[PDB]
Amino acid sequence: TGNAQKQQDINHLLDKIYEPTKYPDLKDIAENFNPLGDTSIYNDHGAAVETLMKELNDHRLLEQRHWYSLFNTRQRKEALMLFAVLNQCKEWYCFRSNAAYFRERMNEGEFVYALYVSVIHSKLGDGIVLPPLYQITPHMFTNSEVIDKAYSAKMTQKPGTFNVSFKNREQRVAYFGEDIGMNIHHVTWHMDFPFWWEDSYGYHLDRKGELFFWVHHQLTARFDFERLSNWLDPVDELHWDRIIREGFAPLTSYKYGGEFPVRPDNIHFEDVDGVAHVHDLEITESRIHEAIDHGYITDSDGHTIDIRQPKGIELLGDIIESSKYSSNVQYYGSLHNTAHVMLGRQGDPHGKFNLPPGVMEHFETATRDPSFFRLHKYMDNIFKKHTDSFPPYTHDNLEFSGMVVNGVAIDGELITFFDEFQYSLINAVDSGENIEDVEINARVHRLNHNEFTYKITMSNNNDGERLATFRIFLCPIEDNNGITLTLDEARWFCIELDKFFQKVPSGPETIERSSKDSSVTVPDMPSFQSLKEQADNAVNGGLDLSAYERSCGIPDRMLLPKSKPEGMEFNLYVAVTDGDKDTEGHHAQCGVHGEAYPDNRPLGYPLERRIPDERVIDGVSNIKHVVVKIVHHL
Amino acid sequence: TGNAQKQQDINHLLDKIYEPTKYPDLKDIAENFNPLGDTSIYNDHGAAVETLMKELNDHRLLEQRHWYSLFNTRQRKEALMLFAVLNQCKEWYCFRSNAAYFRERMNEGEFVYALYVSVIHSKLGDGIVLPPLYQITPHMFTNSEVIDKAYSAKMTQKPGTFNVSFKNREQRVAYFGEDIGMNIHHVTWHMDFPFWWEDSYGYHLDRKGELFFWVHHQLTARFDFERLSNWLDPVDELHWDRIIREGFAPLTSYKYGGEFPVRPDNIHFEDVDGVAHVHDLEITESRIHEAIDHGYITDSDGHTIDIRQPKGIELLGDIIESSKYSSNVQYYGSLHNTAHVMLGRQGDPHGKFNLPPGVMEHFETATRDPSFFRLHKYMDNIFKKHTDSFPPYTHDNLEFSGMVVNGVAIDGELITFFDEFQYSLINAVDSGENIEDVEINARVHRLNHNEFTYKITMSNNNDGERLATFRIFLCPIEDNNGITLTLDEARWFCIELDKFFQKVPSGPETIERSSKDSSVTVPDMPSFQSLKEQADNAVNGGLDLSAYERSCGIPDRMLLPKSKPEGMEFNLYVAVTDGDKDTEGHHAQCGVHGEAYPDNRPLGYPLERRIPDERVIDGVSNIKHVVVKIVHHL
Ligand SMILES: [Cu+2]
Ligand SMILES: [Cu+2]
Ligand SMILES: [Cu+2]
Ligand SMILES: [Cu+2]
């Protein structure tokens, strides 16, 4: 073991992935190993192994140097079998071996996918930090131009970094969707808590349901915000009976595959052969919308499982996205997933052209296409229908008697601008042998803000020390019409900025906290070379980069919304609930390994419920709202 | 001079076009020359030169390593200025110089275009054979896959040759449209007789009008035939008020530019910003259709120019395509051309995506897209409306008293199969310096037939030697329903197979002629390396290369249609008209330089007119029809 070992191995595995490995060890392994000759390394007595082999043998596994979408029911199954081996290894000797043996005869997508999920969930992958997808397989995160510029570099053996690109559209709020950080998170989030997880794999992802509800509600919110800042209007909800108003051209290309199919604007949704009928959604949507409206979800037996309770919204998220936690998957089908594949072939439904899958039929690339947000607004208000059926909250309800926020102040400035980043285009260009490596780079333009700190002034009238949950939302104020909405109109529009638990003493305290300590944030990740340089140094000298092991969050750069240059006033919500009942039972942020989500309040507390008369939020001591102002430096 | 010189120079000029020249001579020229210091080499006292310079100087000329469509009113103008210099050179010292000087600071497309047109039309380019576009700029004629396979070859410096590709469509009659020979011809035909020719350039292309009418009538016919052979039905005529039923994905890529924009099926024609309104066509079409119907074309003054005469159909072709021979271009606009650009941006009319031009906005690539033939059927029956207004032909009309065809026979076997061809992908991949040349090749699958000869047996009942025009059409018989049409239904459907003038001696003769001597055919062209090798062998060893210096025709391989394996019976038409009245006045096939078309009969004689009662064709001695049969070897 070690890690600067485990780590090393990983880096080697995912190095120049589109070509047989150049690391000699990996290849004699790749050749001499037999996953079937010491059914003991395996905790299954190698049933997993024996099942991959069988396929690899009848050679009925997807070919190498071919595309792969995680939405392809077979490609998925294959990818997921590698997971299942790697997964029941007792120690490194068995992982390295397989993710070498297979690495060399299994397709790259299945492989990249398999290795990551495996590293993330398997018992055996603690020490490791995974290189950033963007540099491992750059075709999924880089433009088509820069890609070709990189192939030229290589043809000519002349190095250097190319500048990527992005007045005519709404490819004005593009900086958001096309960011390599969001794209990362978006994929990671669904790697952390995959739709395909069976608790057989080892543990149970806790509230994947609410997690699902919430994560998208926030992309959806975060997204709505940016369009605000751009004189753009909140996003249309997608309907199956209407036209797809805003279509786009991605100008993105597959490594092996071709160029992502484009969609024209004002198109009519076609029945796509092999996935499902347009109507098939319409009905699914109905079945869903009836559970919500009845009060119950009905399983396979005709057993009504009640959802007019706290477990409610997850049971709902199980049927909506359609993970395996689904009660009656034969009835409620899979709205979300199908909706993906469904929106993707819109470029070729009967498939007369044999265009590859589309931007939306992939996690590291969906945020790309505009209907992405159109499709999640729709999912969003499916949930809202349920979320909203609860009776508003009472006074006695929000009140954390004693504790009272006196004041809230921002110790700094809220200022956002446009930084510049560089990732490397090397895994993208093929370098054969005895021809050498030319360093080609890609330079992108991403958003950023300035660290700032919070000065939360507040008195614990209670006799002594109480644990407290510091909940901070950033809601909007006006309409982009100039209509000041109402913490009903705006409660749902708010994006979570931070959530943390601090013990409060008996008396006037002044709790301070930084842009940096935010719980919904993750720093940009270490470069690959960086992770190489570092793996290698430990192994030859004698790696606690327990910075980057889990990381569920969004990019720190994305914390605050972009804003206007003129500036705008947002409304800052500081709600301080009672820590002892919250954490009334138990990372725990990235419960990647079965780790029980620590907060018990539902998600978005306490703005997740109808707020009919603001009269109320306003009279609980432990809730306080102060207006902030964000400015954008050009 | 020489030619094995002129030639050499050319080959050098058009080598690895996408990069500054490696031929030292070309560069000191490229540097030291000044197109403005001996205004004497120029027959204009260099007004041309002084106009390019002015642009090159204010640097308002299109950039290098960028795309270019010949449909772009500016790109065209720029391209066409180079033509105008190269054009008024007195000798080689001035051409070489310029097409060196410019070659290095003008864009490649303008440049390639400029050089060819210039070589083709300028007084000074007799000896020369131009390399095949397909190998000069392979991106416009080669797939998107093979192209990438070639970039890989190059990256790794491992040579190869790749096999190109083409059950779900009508990309079953694809072999026709995607052939590198047709594509060549199509562009050449439009280089030979350009729409932009002003007679200031030096001479007058004779019947560009009828030429235009006809050339497209035959692609259109030839095309209809192939679809026959494929259980496919004759092509729909395109309308501006209907859906674009049948769209395609070209899977083709620009060198500098991106991937050609694709079109979804069942699309509605959008008003495309910058080119023209959909309605703008509709009216044009009307104005056109009213000339035809009135009997006259009305010019700018309100002068009615009659067209119910022989000059008729060309005057019509001048206004329809809209060349500069147009009588009232401000009124009849440019249906054909505009229709090209109009159909191309259908992927991006308001241009929100900034997709490059499309397959149809280029001559070496339009035959690609299915609406290509849909758009020419439409143009086709615009002409037919006029062509058909003439009173049928009388008996006394077709009769070449004396001369009488006794019999007609094919002396071979009519057999068409699928050969294999290889062109080179080198100008496509960038090779910088001190990095050496790897030979990469592309292998295509093209149609072919077997030389066969005609055995035309016929007696001269007259008293002593009459000249004769041997006109041979290949008409269809059955419907693809199995209905069997009527040399009215089928007269227009016939493709020209040969046309030649032979002296018929008095009495029983038996003229024989070959597949090879056909007048509507051209052999595949010499390779580039071949043309290099041969150019090069004749500097050093003190070049005829005469077979390919103009070349209007279609590929010999395309002579006969594809057919069925079962075989089908076509109807062979041998009509022998009177040579002395035909050539009653004067290459002359490729009148590229002002050379008066030799035949005087209108075009398609004598099948261009309504044939109401076959009763007639049937009773002129000098017309004879015999059924042939074509078989396809799988
Ligand atoms: Cu997602
Ligand atoms: Cu989603
Ligand atoms: Cu044409
Ligand atoms: Cu045309």
DSSP string, A387-439: HTSSPPP-HHHH--SS-EEEEEEEES--EEEE--EEEE-TTTS---SSS----
Distance CA B634, CA B631 (A): 10
Tell me how crowded residue A411 is: count the other CB atoms within 10 A of its CB: 12
The C-alpha of A371 sits at a distance from chain B's nearest C-alpha, in angstroms, of 15
Would A166-389 and A390-419+447-524+543-634 be classified into the same CATH topology? Answer: no
Give the 3-state secondary structure of residue A263: coil
Alpha carbon of B574 to ligand 2 centroid (Å): 68
Q: Which two tokens stand for residue A22?
A: 């150049």
Question: Measured between CB atoms, does B249 come within 8 Å of chain A?
Answer: yes
The C-alpha of B430 sits at a distance from chain A's nearest C-alpha, in angstroms, of 6
Distance CA B208, CA B591 (A): 10
Distance CA B610, CA B624 (A): 18
Instruction: Name the pairing type of β-strands A267-268 and A243-244.
Output: antiparallel
Q: Do A155 and B431 touch (CB under 8 A)?
A: yes
The C-alpha of B367 sits at a distance from chain A's nearest C-alpha, in angstroms, of 17
Q: Would you give the distance in Å from CA B144 to the centre of its chain? A: 23
Is residue A622 within 8 Å of residue A577, measured between CB atoms?
Answer: yes
Beta bridge partners of A512: A455
The C-alpha of B99 sits at a distance from chain A's nearest C-alpha, in angstroms, of 26
How far are the Cα atoms of A310, A503, A507, A574, A578 from residue A469, in angstroms, in the given order?
19, 9, 17, 10, 6
Distance CA A339, CA A522 (A): 29
Q: How big is the A-B interface in CB pairs under 8 Å?
A: 88
Distance CA B29, CA B308 (A): 55
Residues ≥6 apart with Cβ < 8 Å to A24? none
Residues of A in contact with B145 (CB under 8 A): 258
Tell me how crowded residue B338 is: count the other CB atoms within 10 A of its CB: 18
What is the DSSP code string of B577-612? EEHHHHTS----SS-TTS---S--S-TTTTSSS--S
Domain ranges in chain A are 1-165+420-446+525-542, 166-389, 390-419+447-524+543-634
Phi, psi of B263 (to 5 degrees): -125, 130
Q: Would you give the distance in Å from CA A301 to the centre of its chain? A: 34
User: What DSSP character marks residue A443?
Assistant: E
Residues ≥6 apart with Cβ < 8 Å to A545? A129, A526, A531, A534
Is residue B491 within 8 Å of residue B482, measured between CB atoms?
Answer: no
Of B258, B347, B432, the CB nearest to A144: B258
Give the 3-state secondary structure of residue B512: strand
Q: Which two tokens stand for residue A405?
A: 């926020």
Sign of CA dihedral A71, A190, A367, A268: positive
Alpha carbon of B230 to ligand 2 centroid (Å): 44
Minimal Cα distance from B167: which residue of A?
A: A352
Question: Measured between CB atoms, does A429 come within 8 Å of chain B?
Answer: yes
Minimal Cα distance from A432: which residue of B?
A: B156
Phi, psi of B48 (to 5 degrees): -60, -60
Alpha carbon of A376 to ligand 1 centroid (Å): 9
User: What DSSP character marks residue A42?
Assistant: B
For residue B505, say if its preceding peptide bond is cis, omega within 30 degrees of 0.
no
B350 annotated as ligand-binding? no
Q: Which two tokens stand for residue A28?
A: 């004699």
Long-range pairs for A197-200 at CB < 8 Å and ≥24 separation?
Answer: A197/A323, A197/A324, A198/A324
Note the resolution in Å, 1 decimal: 3.2
Beta bridge partners of B423: B442
Give the 3-state secondary structure of residue B522: strand
Helix A92-101 with A24-32: angle, nearest 10 deg: 90
Q: Which two tokens stand for residue A358?
A: 């589309």
Q: Do A262 and B265 touch (CB under 8 A)?
A: no
Residues of A in contact with B262 (CB under 8 A): 261-262, 347, 353, 355
Q: Do B249 and A157 touch (CB under 8 A)?
A: no
Question: Measured between CB atoms, does A158 come within 8 Å of chain B?
Answer: yes
Of A267, A346, A352, the CB nearest to B169: A352
Instruction: Strands of B319-475 (E only): list them.
Output: 404-411, 415-418, 421-424, 440-444, 447-449, 453-459, 466-475
Looking up tokens 């062979």 gives: B572
Q: Do A430 and B156 touch (CB under 8 A)?
A: yes
Q: Do B155 and A152 touch (CB under 8 A)?
A: no
Of A169, A259, A267, the CB nearest to B264: A267
Residue A551 C-beta-side C-alpha neighbours within 13 Å? 25
Of A156, A168, A435, the CB nearest to B350: A168
Is residue B386 within 8 Å of residue B316, measured between CB atoms?
Answer: yes
Q: Which two tokens stand for residue A591?
A: 């419960």
Distance CA B509, CA B507 (A): 6
Tell me how crowded residue A60 is: count the other CB atoms within 10 A of its CB: 10
Q: Of B22, B183, B40, B211, which is closest to residue B100 (Cα–Cα)?
A: B22
The C-alpha of B139 sits at a distance from chain A's nearest C-alpha, in angstroms, of 14
Q: What is the 3-state secondary structure (H, E, C) of A345-383?
A: HHHCCCCCCCCCCCCCCCCCCHHHCCHHHHHHHHHHHHH
The C-alpha of B274 sits at a distance from chain A's nearest C-alpha, in angstroms, of 14
Of A262, A266, A267, the CB nearest to B262: A262
Residues ≥6 apart with Cβ < 8 Å to B451? B412, B514, B515, B516
Is residue A545 within 8 Å of residue A605, measured between CB atoms?
Answer: no
User: What DSSP character marks residue A200?
Assistant: G
Q: Of B80, B142, B149, B152, which is closest to residue B109 (Cα–Cα)?
A: B80
Q: Which fold has domain B390-419+447-524+543-634?
A: Immunoglobulin-like (2.60.40)
Distance CA B346, CA B262 (A): 9
The CA angle A343-A349-A354, to the nearest 5 degrees, is 110
Give the 3-state secondary structure of residue A306: strand
Sign of CA dihedral A370, A374, A379, A384: positive
First CA to last CA distance, chain B: 50
Residues ≥6 apart with Cβ < 8 Å to B629? B414, B567, B568, B569, B570
Is residue B606 within 8 Å of residue B393, measured between CB atoms?
Answer: yes
Residues ≥6 apart with Cβ < 8 Å to A435? A157, B155, B156, B157
Minimal Cα distance from B19: which residue of A?
A: A156
Is residue A422 within 8 Å of residue A466, measured between CB atoms?
Answer: no
Q: Which two tokens stand for residue A301?
A: 């037996």
Instruction: List residues forming the annotated binding site of A.
Output: 186, 190, 216, 336, 340, 376
Distance CA A79, CA A255 (A): 18
Question: Measured between CB atoms, does A317 come within 8 Å of chain B?
Answer: no
Q: Would you give the distance in Å from CA A476 to the centre of its chain? A: 24
Is residue A181 within 8 Å of residue A557, measured between CB atoms?
Answer: yes
Distance CA A609, CA A632 (A): 32
Distance CA A374, CA B170 (A): 35
Is residue B619 within 8 Å of residue B565, measured between CB atoms?
Answer: no
Q: What is the CA radius of gyration of chain B?
A: 25
Is residue A403 within 8 Å of residue A466, measured between CB atoms?
Answer: yes
Is residue B340 within 8 Å of residue B320, measured between CB atoms?
Answer: no
Question: Measured between CB atoms, does B174 come within 8 Å of chain A?
Answer: no
Q: Of B372, B417, B378, which is closest to residue B223 (Cα–Cα)?
A: B372
CATH superfamily membership of B166-389: Di-copper center containing domain from catechol oxidase (1.10.1280.10)
Phi, psi of B315 (to 5 degrees): -45, -40
Q: Which two tokens stand for residue B197?
A: 């020719």
Give the 3-state secondary structure of residue A16: coil
First CA to last CA distance, chain A: 50
Distance CA B368, CA A291 (A): 52
Counting ligands in written order, the one closest to the CA of B360 is 4
Q: Of A73, A65, A124, A71, which is closest to residue A99 (Cα–Cα)?
A: A124
Distance CA B287, CA B330 (A): 11
Give the 3-state secondary structure of residue A473: strand
Minimal Cα distance from B248: which residue of A?
A: A353
Question: Measured between CB atoms, does B355 come within 8 Å of chain A?
Answer: yes
Q: Which two tokens stand for residue A164?
A: 């990527």
What is the H or E stretch that residue B620 is in?
none
Instruction: List residues forming the annotated binding site of A for Cu cation.
Output: 186, 190, 216, 336, 340, 376
The CA angle B70-B74-B80, to the nearest 5 degrees, is 65
Q: Which two tokens stand for residue A199?
A: 């608790």
Peptide-bond breaks in chain A following residues (C–N over 2.5 A): 166, 542, 586
The sheet carrying A415-418 orders its strands as A447-449, A415-418, A623-632, A568-578, A466-475, A495-504
Is residue B454 within 8 Å of residue B474, measured between CB atoms?
Answer: no
Tell me how crowded residue B482 is: count the other CB atoms within 10 A of its CB: 6
Distance CA A170, CA A274 (A): 32
Q: Which two tokens stand for residue A198?
A: 């069976």
